[PDB]
Amino acid sequence: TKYAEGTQPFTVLIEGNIGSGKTTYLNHFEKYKNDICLLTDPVEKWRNVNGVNLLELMYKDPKKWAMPFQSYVTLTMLQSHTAPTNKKLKIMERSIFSARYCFVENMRRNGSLEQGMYNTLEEWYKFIEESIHVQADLIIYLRTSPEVAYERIRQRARSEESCVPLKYLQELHELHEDWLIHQRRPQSCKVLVLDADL
Amino acid sequence: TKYAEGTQPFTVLIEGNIGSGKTTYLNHFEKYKNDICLLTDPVEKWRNVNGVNLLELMYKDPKKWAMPFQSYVTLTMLQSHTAPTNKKLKIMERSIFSARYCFVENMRRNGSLEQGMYNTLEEWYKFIEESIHVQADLIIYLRTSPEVAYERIRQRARSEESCVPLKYLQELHELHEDWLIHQRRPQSCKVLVLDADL
Numbered sequence: 001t002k003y004a005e006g007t008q009p010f011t012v013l014i015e016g017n018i019g020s021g022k023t024t025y026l027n028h029f030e031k032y033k034n035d036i037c038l039l040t041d042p043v044e045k046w047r048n049v050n051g052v053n054l055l056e057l058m059y060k061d062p063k064k065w066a067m068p069f070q071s072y073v074t075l076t077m078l079q080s081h082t083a084p085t086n087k088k089l090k091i092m093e094r095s096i097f098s099a100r101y102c103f104v105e106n107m108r109r110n111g112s113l114e115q116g117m118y119n120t121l122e123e124w125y126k127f128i129e130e131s132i133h134v135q136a137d138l139i140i141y142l143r144t145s146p147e148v149a150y151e152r153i154r155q156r157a158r159s160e161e162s163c164v165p166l167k168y169l170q171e172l173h174e175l176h177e178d179w180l181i182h183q184r185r186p187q188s189c190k191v192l193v194l195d196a197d198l
Numbered sequence: 199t200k201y202a203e204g205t206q207p208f209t210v211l212i213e214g215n216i217g218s219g220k221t222t223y224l225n226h227f228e229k230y231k232n233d234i235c236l237l238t239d240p241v242e243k244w245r246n247v248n249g250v251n252l253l254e255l256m257y258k259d260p261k262k263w264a265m266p267f268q269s270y271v272t273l274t275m276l277q278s279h280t281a282p283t284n285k286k287l288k289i290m291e292r293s294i295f296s297a298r299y300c301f302v303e304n305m306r307r308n309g310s311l312e313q314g315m316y317n318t319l320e321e322w323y324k325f326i327e328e329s330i331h332v333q334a335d336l337i338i339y340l341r342t343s344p345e346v347a348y349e350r351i352r353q354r355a356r357s358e359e360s361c362v363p364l365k366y367l368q369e370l371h372e373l374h375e376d377w378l379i380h381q382r383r384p385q386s387c388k389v390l391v392l393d394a395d396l
């Protein structure tokens with residue numbers, strides 16, 4: 001009796017650090033557009049919310065903007081998770097799970113999110129889990145070293161990501177490990193590990 | 199196919215300004231506890247989120263805390279709107295509609311919520327409308343003058359509300375009028391007006 005329950009096909013989630021090549025990997029499935037539902041680069045939504053760049057505001061002023069930004073990230077993931085499709089396969093760049101277990105968690109650790117903000121978000125995640133169906137059958141984890149991840153972010157040269165230190169990517173990498181390999185976080189899904197260092 | 203669709207009885211929403219006597223009115227239905235589902239004073243949740251007083255933080259630092267606070271207000275309203283009950287009647291203090299049309303809107307107007315924060319919240323409200331069933335059959339509008347509303351807030355003497363000016367209550371009153379009498383906002387429901395000046 002959850003929202004979008006029984007309306008979703010086999011769902012594959014593409015995960016990995018910033019600049020791990022999530023979009024590049026999903027760009028290979030481009031020939032089967034009419035066969036597979038492909039939702040790539042949700043970051044473009046976050047860079048342009050009716051003209052407002054939430055990603056830029058988050059990086060410039062985390063103490064003020066990390067909360068509304070993560071809230072919006074959660075929303076867009078949800079809208080993608082529950083989007084209607086007549087296709088037999090759906091591949092998604094990112095998910096609600098990485099937003100929660102990797103990014104929200106690290107922003108709690110580094111002090112970008114105050115306790116009250118972290119708690120508000122966590123209580124939202126718990127309610128979403130009982131109200132909204134999130135289809136997750138397989139997660140492909142594009143495993144990279146923080147050094148290679150940093151290389152790709154530099155080459156793409158998003159103005160918002162120009163101040164991102166290697167320390168930040170090292171933290172996120174370890175959280176990706178905790179969630180997808182070390183199972184320190186609650187998630188019941190099949191994970192395929194890939195060496196994404198080309 | 200929305201969450202909690204077809205599981206909700208006749209729902210009455212009690213609305214009105216801060217200190218309009220919403221709880222006092224609902225306290226009269228106290229004898230029929232086993233007959234009517236009574237969810238009063240959701241503000242107590244906001245004053246204590248695992249020990250964090252979000253209401254106090256919002257009033258102390260609106261530019262930083264109005265966003266997470268309204269996000270949590272929305273959540274608690276949703277949890278109350280969709281709460282399971284075997285009773286034939288449900289009466290609710292406040293709703294998701296007043297949080298959106300009165301409080302979020304006024305915080306946008308006074309600059310407590312930046313555009314990006316207002317937009318994030320508004321996009322959440324739009325998605326909630328398609329995903330989650332909100333039962334609303336009758337709204338009882340306890341109509342007060344901002345002066346009488348101010349009187350009651352002072353007598354209750356919530357430490358968080360000690361700095362609330364009459365200007366703020368005048369703004370909220372007019373928004374309550376716009377929504378429930380003047381129909382300035384895209385909404386349609388049964389409204390019973392009451393003179394709550396004792």
Ligand SMILES: Cc1cn([C@H]2C[C@H](O)[C@@H](COP(=O)(O)OP(=O)(O)OP(=O)(O)O)O2)c(=O)[nH]c1=O
Binds near residue numbers: 021073103104
């Ligand atoms: C998912 C998510 C991303 N972000 C940020 C980190 C990044 O700067 C940006 C998008 O990163 P990613 O979500 O990793 O997407 P990407 O396109 O950068 O990945 P790839 O290069 O492998 O295709 O948004 C958050 O701040 N919080 C979140 O919850």
Ligand SMILES: Cc1cn([C@H]2C[C@H](O)[C@@H](COP(=O)(O)OP(=O)(O)OP(=O)(O)O)O2)c(=O)[nH]c1=O
Binds near residue numbers: 219239292296301
């Ligand atoms: C509903 C709501 C309340 N608030 C704040 C305003 C008040 O300080 C506090 C509770 O206000 P009310 O929701 O009006 O609850 P109340 O108990 O004060 O009402 P009454 O006296 O009529 O029983 O929470 C918001 O900031 N945003 C909201 O969306």
Ligand SMILES: [Mg+2]
Binds near residue numbers: 022023024
């Ligand atoms: Mg990408």
Ligand SMILES: [Mg+2]
Binds near residue numbers: 239
């Ligand atoms: Mg009350």
